[PDB]
């Protein structure tokens, strides 16, 4: 739909920042479409990833970081608040010790900081979705 | 690039048919883009899949069928002829007993028929690629 996918935006994050995404899977859950949100340390797509959030709709979520080019300790969740065929609203809040992922208003996943969020310079949203909204807050100092 | 992705085309297949695809991954292999080609029994995306071919570029290939809505016995290959950052040419030939997948002219994967290829009514090509060519042969009776 409206925004380009893969979607790339320069970004700065700190405690109190929120990244808000509105989109829809491109396929029914039976076909296992994916969604991925990556918080990168540079604008280049091959740069390190402080927080990698990957949904296999209807199946599982995996989270990780990519440090000096190498994937670190993968974490897995079977929590699946996303609904088959429906638009979703995803919010990722930067808390002092972790990222908190809300789905349609419900706390759904967390990921403890492995690298300070101040290292982020870019966010990429990609894989099997359309995207109508992407917003980063910049109100706090 | 040129063709829409997800790409859907009605199709009929039999021994001697070839499906030829030209495309490029949308991301470097470090980011693990996917490619999927599904041979469906109906036009609807939720229909059964006689042959499901899924590449995780730089990592692995998995193949399966989806019968009466349920995934069957998954097969896995670590063969990876695809080249990082490069356009690929993929050919899928319908042989009497199997599909044969050529990548850039090299025999790379096979998958024995679980369902007659005559059951196919649609092919879908999707996930993290751009596509410039899709062709099915219709020359043999």
């Amino acid at each position: 739909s409206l925004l380009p996918v893969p979607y790339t935006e320069a970004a700065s994050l700190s405690t109190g920042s929120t990244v808000t995404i509105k989109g829809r899977p491109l396929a029914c859950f039976l076909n296992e479409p994916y969604l991925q949100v990556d918080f990168h340390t540079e604008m280049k797509e091959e740069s390190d990833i402080v927080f990698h959030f990957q949904v296999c709709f209807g199946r599982r979520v995996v989270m990780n970081s990519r440090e000096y080019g190498a994937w670190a300790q993968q974490v897995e969740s079977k929590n699946m608040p996303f609904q088959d065929g429906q638009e979703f609203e995803l919010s990722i809040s930067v808390l002092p010790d972790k990222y908190q992922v809300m789905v349609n208003g419900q706390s759904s996943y967390t990921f403890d900081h492995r690298i300070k969020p101040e290292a982020v310079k870019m966010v990429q949203v990609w894989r099997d979705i359309s995207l109508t909204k992407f917003n980063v807050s910049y109100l706090k100092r």
Side-chain angles (χ1 to χ4, degrees), chain A residues 1-21 23-44 46-58 60-88 90-115 117-132 134-140:
Chain A
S1 67
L2 277 108
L3 292 167
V5 179
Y7 182 86
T8 305
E9 186 172 308
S12 296
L13 303 176
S14 62
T15 299
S17 298
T18 297
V19 181
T20 298
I21 298 160
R24 187 188 305 266
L26 294 178
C28 65
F29 280 17
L30 194 61
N31 290 352
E32 304 186 6
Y34 287 91
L35 159 70
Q36 187 157 326
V37 179
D38 293 314
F39 291 178
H40 280 264
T41 60
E42 306 287 347
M43 289 296 305
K44 297 190 305 195
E46 65 269 25
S47 67
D48 286 354
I49 296 171
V50 170
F51 177 40
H52 150 83
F53 175 81
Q54 185 195 92
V55 183
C56 182
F57 286 103
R60 66 172 189 167
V61 173
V62 305
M63 293 176 288
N64 210 340
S65 57
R66 189 171 69 205
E67 307 178 26
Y68 308 91
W71 294 104
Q73 177 56 241
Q74 168 175 114
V75 169
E76 182 188 32
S77 174
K78 295 295 175 53
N79 195 25
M80 189 55 54
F82 301 96
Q83 299 300 301
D84 199 354
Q86 304 308 312
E87 181 177 74
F88 56 83
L90 185 72
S91 201
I92 303 173
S93 297
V94 186
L95 313 184
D97 286 2
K98 70 193 103 174
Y99 299 100
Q100 179 171 44
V101 183
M102 320 281 292
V103 181
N104 302 324
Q106 179 188 174
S107 177
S108 298
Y109 316 92
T110 64
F111 185 86
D112 286 348
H113 296 309
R114 301 174 176 182
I115 302 162
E118 285 80 7
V120 175
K121 294 186 180 65
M122 175 271 273
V123 178
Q124 188 168 75
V125 181
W126 63 298
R127 303 212 192 258
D128 310 298
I129 71 152
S130 60
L131 178 64
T132 56
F134 181 94
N135 181 249
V136 178
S137 59
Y138 285 100
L139 279 56
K140 295 180 55 180

